[PDB]
Design a protein around this ligand. Sequence first.
Ligand SMILES: CNC(=O)c1cc(-n2ncc3cc(Nc4c(F)cccc4Cl)c(CN4CCC4)cc32)cs1
Length: 346
Amino acid sequence: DNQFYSVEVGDSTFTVLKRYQNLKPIGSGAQGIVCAAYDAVLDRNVAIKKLSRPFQNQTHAKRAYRELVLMKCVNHKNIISLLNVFTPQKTLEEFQDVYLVMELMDANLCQVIQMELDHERMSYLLYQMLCGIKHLHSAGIIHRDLKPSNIVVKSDCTLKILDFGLASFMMTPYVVTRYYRAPEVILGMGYKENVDIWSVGCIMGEMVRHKILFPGRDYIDQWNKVIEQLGTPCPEFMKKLQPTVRNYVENRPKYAGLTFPKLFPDSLFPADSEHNKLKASQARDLLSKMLVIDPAKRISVDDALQHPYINVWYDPAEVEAPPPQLDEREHTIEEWKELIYKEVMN
Ligand SMILES: CNC(=O)c1cc(-n2ncc3cc(Nc4c(F)cccc4Cl)c(CN4CCC4)cc32)cs1
């Protein structure tokens, strides 16, 4: 009779449509754990995420709404697309939880980062991250918080970005990973498209180094790590800083910054064949153009896609997809509950 059934998964209750069978945990993270399942209607493995009362506060509310709305503005194989959205609640009044369903993938990008990867796979993951980003930007979406824990891959080396970035405070123990954020974001500057190239550079760099490039308890520690390694930015970069942030960054110790062979020595790269020796120097060259503090000197998404490290994968039908609601206003719980509910059933 009921379309739904409930099963305890790790600790959470999943109330899902009966088409989804054999639920099992695959990890948690931020708002809501996720489960793998077999979808008996489509005869394929899916991943199901529970948003628990996403209207309970503005942080959870804004991004649940945002991501439901933005889902319909993108259509690209390196960007999440949902297979199903449902609530087991029957009315706005009883409405509580949202479930999102997508293709089951094989691994998060964090796991892939810990592997020794050839150049063909590294360059292909990067190519795909750049294609996704480009799709987002062409749709008017600038991410600003790309990070590996929100990127997933299949065994065939294919890759999907799962979130849409920045639009705060939550009483939960959940903690925000900030290490992949551009200087523009760390320092509250204007930004444009290539804010996201920085994050691609932090990921690429960590794939080679197998350590977070710019760790830290908060932006104070993080900024220090940026300047220690890349050096103090030029005066031209300083003039773009708001007067108070500007005074702070100019009074930090001036650092020369290490060269990019020093920051990513040859020992980190496969370099046994001539082919691999060349790919190493191409990898480092691209890194040196992405990990650039000043966005006015940082390479763009389009030029990074033409870099020799990356463009061996270039296909016109992959980079230029056809492009295609705005509410970040402060709402109460009630407004947000109805806004999300409506999107859930359109
Ligand atoms: C044997 N396979 C495995 O072990 C693995 C497979 C996965 N995988 N595949 C798809 C997927 C999706 C998300 N979330 C999600 C969802 F589930 C449904 C709709 C929208 C979204 Cl955003 C998560 C959770 N991650 C992302 C940060 C925590 C992991 C995911 C990774 S490991």
